[PDB]
């Protein structure tokens, strides 16, 4: 098949910056090359067709160039809403083939997370498990550290976390961490806390609650 290699695989730039993404086909595709943009959880959306033509409805900051085996997608002034993964697609011959995708992230000013902690619900406690959740909201950069403490003792191996994709309007991230304990253990202890470290925080921030109170 015709192999499509995009470069780079990921990049980050600031709002207003020019972004360049390239795509190389293993052999001549005679300009039958389209660029699609895909945001998290959505179907792809065409941007450029036949290497250089701008699709209807697409902002003029998007442009494509190239011929033969080499093609380039340019975004002249990156906008927050441009966060997405960009794919080239050759349709010069079957099978049609896609590049591997290039994820574009927005670079913005540091933003400290807002931190919140949630105890397990009474409804959940009717069973054998208790989940305690900690939310780190709207922060940047993506890197952040969360440590759990039960009765003031640091915890290991009993939590899991996940992070949202960059926000399309304010370019921040949010993170959720879940500490899992048995309902018996939860009912035994008192103080529950999550401690957060982040570039936008001079010292760790701790949010906590006492069971019962």
């Amino acid at each position: 098949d015709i192999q499509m290699t995009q470069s780079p695989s990921s990049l980050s730039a600031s709002v207003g910056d020019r972004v360049t993404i390239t795509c190389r086909a293993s052999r001549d595709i005679k300009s039958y090359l389209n660029w699609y943009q895909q945001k998290p959880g959505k179907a792809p959306k065409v941007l450029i067709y036949y290497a250089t033509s701008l699709a209807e409805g697409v902002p003029s900051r998007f442009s494509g160039s190239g011929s033969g085996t080499d093609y380039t997608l340019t975004i002249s002034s990156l906008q927050p809403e441009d966060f997405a993964t960009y794919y080239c697609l050759q349709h010069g011959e079957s099978p049609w083939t896609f590049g591997q995708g290039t994820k574009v992230e927005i670079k913005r000013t540091v933003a400290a997370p807002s931190v919140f902690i949630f105890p397990p619900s009474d409804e959940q406690l009717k069973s054998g498990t208790a989940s305690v959740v900690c939310l780190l909201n709207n922060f940047y950069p993506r890197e952040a550290k969360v440590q759990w403490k039960v009765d003031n003792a640091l915890q290991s191996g009993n939590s899991q976390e996940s992070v949202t994709e960059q926000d399309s309007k304010d370019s921040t991230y949010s993170l959720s961490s879940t500490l899992t304990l048995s309902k018996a253990d939860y009912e035994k202890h008192k103080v529950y806390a999550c401690e957060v470290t982040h570039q936008g925080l001079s010292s760790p921030v701790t949010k906590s609650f006492n069971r019962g109170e």
Partner: protein
Amino acid sequence: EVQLVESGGGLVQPGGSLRLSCAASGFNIKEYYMHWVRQAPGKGLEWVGLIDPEQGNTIYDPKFQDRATISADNSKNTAYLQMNSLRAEDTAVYYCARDTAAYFDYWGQGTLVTVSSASTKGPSVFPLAPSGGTAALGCLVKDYFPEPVTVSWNSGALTSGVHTFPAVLQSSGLYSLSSVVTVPSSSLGTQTYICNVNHKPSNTKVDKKVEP
């Protein structure tokens, strides 16, 4: 108003078959090439094949030639994809797309097919209740299989401040996911927040009121 609505997603056993539909409205599939494209979780786009609904001709990526069948029913204005002998590698979100020749201009919403020997399990939905000017509340959707689960707030009208996180696989092999929304502290006493959770694989729909 062109629309492509897919169905047939869900859980399938290894070695079984997927059978997806792409129901078109607003145009006649007979006038376009209809294609199928898939995307395994966290990976790139992959072309599956196309059909010319006018006379039924099809072209498949050589990888699927022996196991996939693309077809169409003009009277129902629907295109279909069937793939047999499924394996783990076939777990993916499958999209149907309308091709103008120049480019794909309309896409189905996409439907996840999960190839696993595990059993379907519906989630339990628990409130994450609020404790300066901003507060947060949410819902914990726990112990379900397979993905996906959709969560909205106040029947989908509330999107401001909502963050629904990627599910995580737990030690049991079942998924857990949370959705939170940040709000004015003051609104906790002047209005009610409801998370709506839908898990199609187990036909589960839950509306959970989350109160302080």
